[PDB]
């Protein structure tokens, strides 16, 4: 038993520029691939289960869940709610600048707690394996690093594999999550053919990663910088009180009310 | 002459089938505790003291005290590193009016748990010597840097301990050394340990059940609070990047970690001494510079800014959506939780899992 | 020093080849001749970290000895007896076990005081506690206890303290009718009391605060008053945004123009308003096949890996020697760094490090001998990892020696 | 004013006195501090007692040694043992030493034996009190009649358990006792058996009464004598103590007492701080200004 949780970077800024750029690949083609991929997960196994969440500028909306019209049940109902939910979200869209980043951490938080409920809801005769697939397109928002790191470790503790697909702009945080969680980070070179990458890199089961031959994981440099002048640090000094990093020695924590006891 | 008649139907009519309904709260639990925005001993050197005396053979718990203790110790060791990889562990056993340092100062659960597995075969012998135990510990903590929270956790099974001199020698020394000592006692409260713990800045608690034993241990998993008497240091720390043998192992010989016998061709080098380390975080046994992975740092930042308990209510009287925010789903339970700031709708699992495991509220990130 | 010889044995016993290399380095000036051993010398304070607390068990610990007749296979046990009873200490020095076995002495130990607790000096090993009233004279006669006002003063609380026959006292031991049955009971009492009190004193010197402590401990009530409160420090973070953004270097992020934002919100909204899923938009065989080529085992996405194969020549010989070399070099650098990473610059550490590192210059000479095998016996191999560390060990001292601004 | 005397009905007779009030007060606690129990039944089913006119009966002495040995491992810090007579104490200790029981007790706690010498008393109490505070543990044994039961209060860690071996009857000096008993039959019409019970019970109540002096104090108390199981004797103990002397703990086996003790210790060794005491058993100024305090405390008083 498995539970795929798809995450799509519903960022109107990059996708809007992508739309304005009139490129060969657009959000329309993207959601098509997602729906086909989602269908494939359920299609691959009668017992498999699936959930989809869209990370927008201001909301983490669930895309599940199917329709009741009865033309076709399993795939059509899922696709119809997905189209309806993305349309509701994207058609009934506002315009904001004050808070322009994609709510990635909130979407991941929703997914993790949702997975927790589901895995508890599942009987213990057989247990629900789960993984998250993140499709990132916009820029990596550092302001969520705290939450992002905290949710990575929660996924790690919860033994959840996280995979990520990045379009254009890369992400140190997300690639680091793939490395830590044991998933895989891949920069797709041909966004119009996105679906074929998904159906091979991210679709194989957890029980098949080990059996398939796939692109080796890209080694992630753990570049770090202190809050003071943001320079890169390989060896620095850390406040044992607040763990604020400072590249060079100093008498007081610029990050907090604490004078170091220097000797 | 009461045990065969001890059922609820002994003197009641409806209890003939409602007995398990009248005594229905027989085996449940509901863990929660407080917190506080105070300095924490994030750098932690916690050492475990376990009775090795004949009294450890008693069956106060389900198995002998030894088996239940080692069972919960292994679990505690795991989560201790899991919640603080920066910290380190060491173990000392108090046997034959003597003390034996089961495990040295290290952060490797592999070796620590391996020692536990082997320690299952120990022989409970003689009376405990609290003085000898604290001697070996303090003798070791003397060399630890003042800013590193030097702490000891004691598990006491017996009631009498053989000290070669009044423990006030050690307590006066420990107090002056600002070392902190906490004690967990089995079935009883001992003045010695109570005075020792309360004076030293730790706490003395008594085991009631394996759940209570976990409940107490759980509290000891969280880093202790710190005062201005401890060194407010600006410790130097290394963040070495992993380096494989990319160039066909060229000019990069495989090497055993300072820590281990495993000869690793790739791994983390020491930016200070260029030593080879297959794992991280690892202390430079030949430099003193500790090396820690950037994510391990963030792994502890929740302790700096943890979540607050959500507003609990028996019904979504606020009339939010019938679907719980966060994890989507119906409010099937007549108890709801609402974040004080973002005020979204949260369920039982949200209040438990988000606050105890995610440590981040989704609506607060918005 | 002569004392260091006994303690250093641990290193040579555990690592014999490293000891041989350490001694070789000692002779080859790669390390100091003493340092080859002295680097392992360390000791405790007694038979244990803390004096053996033989305040319990004493001789009773061994049923006579290791055996009814007492065998002679106990040392620390009889040493605990020697520590427990100075009378036995005096006699144990007299009954020398040289050229004999303690079998007889361990058998005689069950005599009187130490096993049956009689009264007079029937002990098998002297008895200054035999005069148990004269042994107690420096405890509660000419001397006293340390709490004797605050407590333990029930000898003088009643109306009997002012005058004896003033009471209706008649119970106490008369000068008429004394008994030896009672002497046996009194001996057990006196022996157990004196033993407990004297043995306790060995661990309890113990104090001037005893009386005042017992007064305050019993006069003050933690129920009506005298709280207990903490004294940690409230952690008010400053510029918490730093943690929100995290310890990451500056990215290459850049904003666009408000027009681009407005158009982006509009264009995507309009696209999503006018959108329907289609199989042709889903995939094309050209896209899939091209992506398969990129993902193929020989495609652009198959980055460098598995380059860390087995060694170019004699991995086993290299690994065998490196084991010893890693232990030796590691143990050498250890001290060099311990001397170099000091809290302050001083000649006691600088010269000790400069000498140690100057010896390490002969260890690089000893590594040149270890380099010959890699450049001769081995067909092709690179031990540059150690060599780079060895170069760094000298480099660091040269860099520090250049810091003549009181740092060197 | 203290809570040691009972039954109050006998003192106006004995002292040929007539008080205005004959009241008693119930110990009011949110968490009991006392568990009086009568372990009158040995594990071997021997009726642990001194009913046999203090005659030499090894079987009860043996049972007394077994109880004390196991209880020494169960009770934390210090123990205080009271014998019915000094002779019996000496006779008993000699048997336990001869039977080796006493060595197993030493392994558990340091024994301190009392004697008429103020030097012994002062040294024993000195070493005992600090032994109860140092790493080790000590076990004081004395006589229910001697000054030790008078001058020393077993507060907190000192004497966390009080053990009364046998009913404290002084059958020695019977002539003087008879004379006073007879005179009490004459001018006061007081039955000798009734007075004897009272006289011993008040001594047991002294040891027990000195076992606790505060709310952050507690004491286990074993009455190792079948006699105590008689409704009359139990009924003549202090009513505030009888409240905890529930029938279920009468004539317990040694094992039952050990198990109940482990339970009682477990139930009270748990943290219970000053703030937790404000729920019940402690009233602040706010509660005093609350008339509830005026009505709630009425039931605390008792009368006899
Ligand atoms: Zn700070
Ligand atoms: Zn290093
Ligand atoms: Zn919130």
Curated annotation (Swiss-Prot), chain A:
A zinc finger (C4-type) spans 239-256. Its main location: nucleus. Keywords: DNA damage, DNA repair, Metal-binding, Nucleus, Transcription, Transcription regulation, Zinc, Zinc-finger. GO terms for cellular component: core TFIIH complex portion of holo TFIIH complex; nucleoplasm; nucleus; transcription factor TFIID complex; transcription factor TFIIH core complex; transcription factor TFIIH holo complex; transcription preinitiation complex. GO terms for molecular function: RNA polymerase II general transcription initiation factor activity; zinc ion binding. It holds the Pfam family Tfb4. InterPro entries: TFIIH_Tfb4/GTF2H3, vWFA_dom_sf. It is found in: Nucleus. It comes from the Eukaryota. GO terms for biological process: DNA repair; nucleotide-excision repair; regulation of DNA-templated transcription; transcription by RNA polymerase II. Component of the general transcription and DNA repair factor IIH (TFIIH) core complex, which is involved in general and transcription-coupled nucleotide excision repair (NER) of damaged DNA and, when complexed to CAK, in RNA transcription by RNA polymerase II. In NER, TFIIH acts by opening DNA around the lesion to allow the excision of the damaged oligonucleotide and its replacement by a new DNA fragment. In transcription, TFIIH has an essential role in transcription initiation. Belongs to the TFB4 family. This is General transcription factor IIH subunit 3. It comes from Homo sapiens (Human).
Curated annotation (Swiss-Prot), chain B:
CDD domains: vWA_transcription_factor_IIH_type. The keyword Heme does not apply. Its main location: nucleus. A zinc finger (C4-type) spans 270-287. This is General transcription factor IIH subunit 2. Residues 45-221 form the VWFA domain. Changing residue 339 to A: No effect on the transcriptional activity of the reconstituted TFIIH complex. GO terms for cellular component: core TFIIH complex portion of holo TFIIH complex; nuclear speck; nucleoplasm; nucleus; transcription factor TFIID complex; transcription factor TFIIH core complex; transcription factor TFIIH holo complex. One of its GO terms (biological process) is transcription initiation at RNA polymerase II promoter. The gene is GTF2H2. The modification Phosphotyrosine is found at residue 80. It is found in: Nucleus. Component of the TFIID-containing RNA polymerase II pre-initiation complex that is composed of TBP and at least GTF2A1, GTF2A2, GTF2E1, GTF2E2, GTF2F1, GTF2H2, GTF2H3, GTF2H4, GTF2H5, GTF2B, TCEA1, ERCC2 and ERCC3. Component of the 7-subunit TFIIH core complex composed of XPB/ERCC3, XPD/ERCC2, GTF2H1, GTF2H2, GTF2H3, GTF2H4 and GTF2H5, which is active in NER. The core complex associates with the 3-subunit CDK-activating kinase (CAK) module composed of CCNH/cyclin H, CDK7 and MNAT1 to form the 10-subunit holoenzyme (holo-TFIIH) active in transcription. Widely expressed, with higher expression in skeletal muscle. Changing residue 324 to A: No effect on the transcriptional activity of the reconstituted TFIIH complex. PROSITE patterns: VWFA. Changing residue 361 to A: No effect on the transcriptional activity of the reconstituted TFIIH complex.
Curated annotation (Swiss-Prot), chain C:
Residues 1-48, 68-117 form the BSD domain. The modification N6-acetyllysine is found at residue 125. Its main location: nucleus. The modification Phosphoserine is found at residue 218. (Microbial infection) Upon Rift valley fever virus infection, interacts with NSs leading to ubiquitination by the NSs-FBXO3 E3 ligase and proteasome-dependent degradation. Component of the general transcription and DNA repair factor IIH (TFIIH) core complex, which is involved in general and transcription-coupled nucleotide excision repair (NER) of damaged DNA and, when complexed to CAK, in RNA transcription by RNA polymerase II. In NER, TFIIH acts by opening DNA around the lesion to allow the excision of the damaged oligonucleotide and its replacement by a new DNA fragment. In transcription, TFIIH has an essential role in transcription initiation. This is General transcription factor IIH subunit 1. The lineage of its organism: Eukaryota, Metazoa, Chordata, Craniata, Vertebrata. The gene is GTF2H1. The chain holds residues 107 to 547 of 548 of the full protein.
From Swiss-Prot, chain D:
Residues 1-181 are annotated as: Mediates interaction with MMS19. It is found in: Nucleus; Cytoplasm, Cytoskeleton, Spindle. ATP-dependent 5'-3' DNA helicase. Component of the general transcription and DNA repair factor IIH (TFIIH) core complex, not absolutely essential for minimal transcription in vitro. Required for transcription-coupled nucleotide excision repair (NER) of damaged DNA; recognizes damaged bases. Sequestered in chromatin on UV-damaged DNA. When complexed to CDK-activating kinase (CAK), involved in transcription by RNA polymerase II. In NER, TFIIH acts by opening DNA around the lesion to allow the excision of the damaged oligonucleotide and its replacement by a new DNA fragment. The gene is ERCC2. The lineage of its organism: Eukaryota, Metazoa, Chordata, Craniata, Vertebrata. Changing residue 146 to D: In XP-D; combined with features of Cockayne syndrome. ISGylated. This is General transcription and DNA repair factor IIH helicase subunit XPD. Belongs to the helicase family. RAD3/XPD subfamily. It comes from the Eukaryota. It comes from Homo sapiens. A motif (Nuclear localization signal) lies at residues 226-239. Interacts with GTF2H2/p44 via the C-terminus of this protein; mutations in the C-terminal region of XPD do not alter its helicase activity, but prevent its interaction with and helicase stimulation by GTF2H2/p44.
């Amino acid at each position: 038993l498995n539970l795929l949780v798809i995450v799509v970077d519903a960022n109107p800024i990059w996708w809007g520029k992508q739309a304005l750029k009139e490129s060969q690949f657009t959000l329309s083609k993207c959601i098509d691939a997602v729906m086909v991929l989602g269908n494939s997960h359920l299609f691959m196994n009668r017992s498999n289960k699936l959930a989809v969440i869209a990370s927008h500028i201001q909301e983490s909306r669930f895309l599940y869940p199917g329709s009741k019209d009865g033309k076709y049940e399993l795939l059509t109902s899922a696709n119809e709610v997905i189209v309806e939910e993305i349309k509701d979200l994207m058609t009934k869209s506002d315009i904001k600048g004050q808070h322009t980043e994609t709510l990635l951490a909130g979407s991941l938080a929703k997914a993790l707690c949702y997975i927790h409920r589901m895995n508890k809801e599942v009987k213990d005769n057989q247990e629900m394996k789960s993984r998250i697939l993140v499709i990132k397109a916009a820029e990596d928002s550092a302001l969520q690093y705290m939450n992002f790191m905290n949710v990575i470790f929660a996924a790690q503790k919860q033994n959840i594999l996280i995979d990520a697909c990045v379009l254009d702009s890369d992400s140190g945080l997300l690639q680091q999550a793939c490395d830590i969680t044991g998933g895989l980070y891949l920069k797709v070179p041909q966004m119009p053919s996105l679906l074929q990458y998904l159906l091979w890199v991210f679709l194989p089961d957890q029980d098949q990663r080990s059996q398939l031959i796939l692109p080796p994981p890209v080694h992630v440099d753990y570049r770090a910088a202190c809050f003071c002048h943001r320079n890169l640090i390989e060896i620095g000094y850390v406040c044992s009180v607040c763990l604020s990093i400072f590249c060079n020695f100093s008498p007081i924590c610029t990050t907090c009310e604490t004078a170091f006891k220097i000797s | 002459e009461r045990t065969w008649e001890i059922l609820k139907e002994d003197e009641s009519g409806s209890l003939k089938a409602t007995i398990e309904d009248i005594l229905f709260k027989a085996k449940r639990k509901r863990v929660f505790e407080h917190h506080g925005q105070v300095r924490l001993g994030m750098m932690r050197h916690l050492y475990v003291v376990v009775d090795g005396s004949r009294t450890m053979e008693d069956q106060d718990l389900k198995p002998n005290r030894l088996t239940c203790t080692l069972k919960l110790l292994e679990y505690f060791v795991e989560e201790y590193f899991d919640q603080n990889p920066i910290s380190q562990i060491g173990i000392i056993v108090t046997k034959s009016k003597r003390a034996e340092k089961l495990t040295e100062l290290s952060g490797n659960p592999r070796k620590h748990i391996t020692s536990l597995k082997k320690a299952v075969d120990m022989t409970c012998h003689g009376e405990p010597s609290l003085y000898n135990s604290l001697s070996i510990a303090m003798q070791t903590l003397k060399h630890m840097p003042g800013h590193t929270s030097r702490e000891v956790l004691i598990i006491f099974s017996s009631l009498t301990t053989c000290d070669p001199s009044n423990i006030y020698d050690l307590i006066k020394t420990l107090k002056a050394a600002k070392i902190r000592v906490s004690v967990i006692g089995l079935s009883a409260e001992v003045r010695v340990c109570t005075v020792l713990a309360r004076e030293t800045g730790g706490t003395y608690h008594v085991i009631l059940d394996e759940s209570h034993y976990k409940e107490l241990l759980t509290h000891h998993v969280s880093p202790p609070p710190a005062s201005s008497s401890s060194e407010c240091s600006l410790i130097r720390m290394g963040f070495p990047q992993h380096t494989i043998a990319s160039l066909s192992d060229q000019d990069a010989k495989p090497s055993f970690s300072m820590a281990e016998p495993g000869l690793t061709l790739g791994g983390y080098f020491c930016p200070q001494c260029r030593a080879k380390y297959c794992e991280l975080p690892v202390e430079c046994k030949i430099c003193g510079l500790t090396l820690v992975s950037a994510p391990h740092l963030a792994r502890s930042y929740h302790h700096l800014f943890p979540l607050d308990a959500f507003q609990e209510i028996p019904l979504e009287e606020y009339n939010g959506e019938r679907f719980c925010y966060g994890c989507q789903g119906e409010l099937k339970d007549q108890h709801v939780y609402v974040c004080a700031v973002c005020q979204n709708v949260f369920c039982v699992d949200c209040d438990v899992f988000v606050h105890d495991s995610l440590h981040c509220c989704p609506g607060c990130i918005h | 020093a002569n004392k260091e010889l006994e303690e250093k044995n641990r290193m040579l016993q555990e690592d014999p080849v490293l000891f041989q290399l350490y001694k070789d380095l000692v002779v080859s000036q790669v390390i100091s001749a003493e340092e080859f051993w002295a680097n392992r010398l360390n000791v405790n304070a007694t038979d244990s970290s803390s004096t053996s607390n033989h305040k319990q068990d004493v001789g009773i610990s061994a049923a006579f000895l290791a055996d009814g007749l007492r065998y002679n296979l106990t040392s620390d046990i009889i040493e605990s007896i020697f520590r427990t009873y100075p009378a036995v200490k005096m006699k144990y020095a007299e009954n020398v076990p040289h050229n004999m076995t303690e079998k007889e002495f361990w058998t005689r130990f069950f005599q009187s005081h130490y096993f049956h607790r009689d009264r007079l000096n029937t002990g098998s090993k002297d008895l200054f506690a035999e005069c148990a009233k004269i042994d107690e004279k420096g405890l509660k006669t000419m001397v006293s206890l340390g709490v004797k006002n605050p407590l333990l003063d029930l000898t003088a609380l009643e109306d009997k303290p002012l005058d004896e026959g003033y009471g209706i006292s008649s119970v106490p031991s008369a000068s008429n009718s004394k008994s030896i049955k009672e002497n046996s009971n009194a001996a057990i009492i006196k022996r157990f009391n004196h033993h407990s009190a004297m043995v306790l004193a060995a661990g309890l010197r113990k104090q001037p605060a005893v009386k005042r402590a017992k007064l305050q401990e019993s006069i003050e009530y933690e129920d009506l008053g005298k709280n207990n409160s903490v004294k940690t420090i409230a952690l008010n973070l400053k510029k918490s945004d730093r943690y929100y953004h995290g310890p990451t270097p500056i990215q290459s992020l850049q904003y666009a123009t408000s027009q681009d934002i407005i158009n982006s919100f509009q264009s995507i909204r309009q696209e999503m308003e006018a959108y329907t899923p289609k199989l042709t938009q889903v995939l094309s065989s050209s896209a899939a096949s091209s992506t398969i080529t990129a993902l193929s085992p020989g495609g652009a996405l198959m980055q460098g890996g598995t380059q860390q194969a087995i060694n170019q020549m004699v991995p086993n010989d290299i690994q065998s020697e490196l084991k010893h070399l890693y232990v030796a070099v590691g143990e050498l650098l250890r001290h060099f760094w311990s001397c170099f990473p000091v809290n302050t610059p001083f000649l006691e550490e600088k010269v000790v490090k400069m000498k140690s590192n100057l010896e390490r210059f002969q260890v690089t000479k000893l590594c040149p001998f270890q380099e010959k095998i890699r450049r001769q016996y081995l067909s092709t191999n690179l031990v540059s990892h150690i060599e780079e560390m060895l170069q760094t060990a000298y480099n660091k001292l040269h860099t520090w020696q250049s810091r003549r601004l009181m740092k060197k | 004013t203290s809570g040691t005397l009972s039954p109050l009905d006998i003192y106006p007779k004995i002292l040929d006195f007539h008080p205005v009030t004959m009241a008693t007060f119930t110990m009011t606690l949110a968490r009991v501090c006392l568990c009086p129990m009568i372990i009158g039944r040995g594990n071997d089913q021997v009726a642990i007692s001194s009913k046999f006119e203090t005659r030499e009966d090894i079987a009860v002495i043996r049972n007394y040694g077994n109880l004390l040995l196991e209880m020494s491992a169960v009770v934390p810090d210090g123990i205080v043992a009271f014998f019915t007579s000094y002779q019996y104490m000496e006779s008993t200790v000699a048997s336990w030493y001869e039977q080796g029981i006493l060595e197993n007790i030493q392994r558990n706690k340091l024994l301190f034996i009392e004697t008429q010498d103020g030097a012994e008393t002062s040294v024993a109490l000195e070493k005992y009190q600090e032994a109860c505070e140092n790493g080790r543990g000590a076990i004081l044994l004395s006589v229910a009649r001697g000054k030790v039961s008078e001058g020393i209060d077993f507060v907190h860690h000192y004497g966390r358990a009080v053990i009364m071996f046998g009913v404290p009857y002084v059958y020695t000096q019977s002539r003087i006792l008879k004379a006073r008993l007879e005179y009490l039959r004459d001018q006061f019409q007081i039955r000798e058996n009734d007075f004897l019970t009272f006289d011993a019970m008040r001594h047991a109540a002294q040891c027990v009464g000195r076992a606790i002096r505060g709310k952050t104090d507690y004491g286990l108390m074993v009455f190792a004598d079948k006699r105590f199981a008689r409704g009359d004797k139990r009924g003549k103990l202090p009513r505030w103590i009888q409240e905890h002397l529930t029938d279920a703990n009468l004539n317990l086996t040694v094992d039952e007492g050990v198990q109940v003790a482990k339970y009682f210790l477990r139930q009270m060794a748990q943290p219970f701080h000053r703030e937790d005491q404000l729920g019940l058993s402690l009233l602040s100024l706010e509660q005093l200004e609350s008339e509830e305090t005026l009505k709630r405390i009425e039931q605390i008083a008792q009368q006899l």
